[PDB]
Write a protein that binds this ligand. Sequence first.
Ligand SMILES: NC(=O)[C@H]1CC(=O)N(Cc2cccc3c2OCC3)C1
Ligand SMILES: [Zn+2]
Length: 140
Amino acid sequence: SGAIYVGNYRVVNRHLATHNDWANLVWEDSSRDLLVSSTTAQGCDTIARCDCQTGVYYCSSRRKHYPVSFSKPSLIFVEASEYYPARYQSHLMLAVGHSEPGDCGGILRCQHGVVGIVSTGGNGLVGFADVRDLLWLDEE
Ligand SMILES: NC(=O)[C@H]1CC(=O)N(Cc2cccc3c2OCC3)C1
Ligand SMILES: [Zn+2]
């Protein structure tokens, strides 16, 4: 589990969104595994606006933050899971690292701020849904 809290927005994995998230919906995209809802309180996270390929992510199944090198956001085939059939997921970045299903939502960050959140895993790989292209998270 886990979310990004930036301005009056809550960014979560679409497959983990709650009823309250759907009832306060701002934007959702199944192909990216992302959903954004509105919040009453202002958040403290800042979004990275960069092309970094190194950062650090939080892994709840190890209670640890790991430094990783990660690929550029792209269209990657993801195996079938409890939440989606086998399909191509867009704006996804892969790294070598530990990830179990419940690790989804952990933040990946670089020197500029939050890059994305854990969305996929298995086989000693971890995949992150990029949010650096969602410029509207910084305003309104
Ligand atoms: N974005 C998606 O399609 C995710 C939905 C889901 O439940 N996925 C399975 C998964 C996530 C994280 C780590 C691991 C996984 O499987 C093995 C370890 C992929
Ligand atoms: Zn950066």
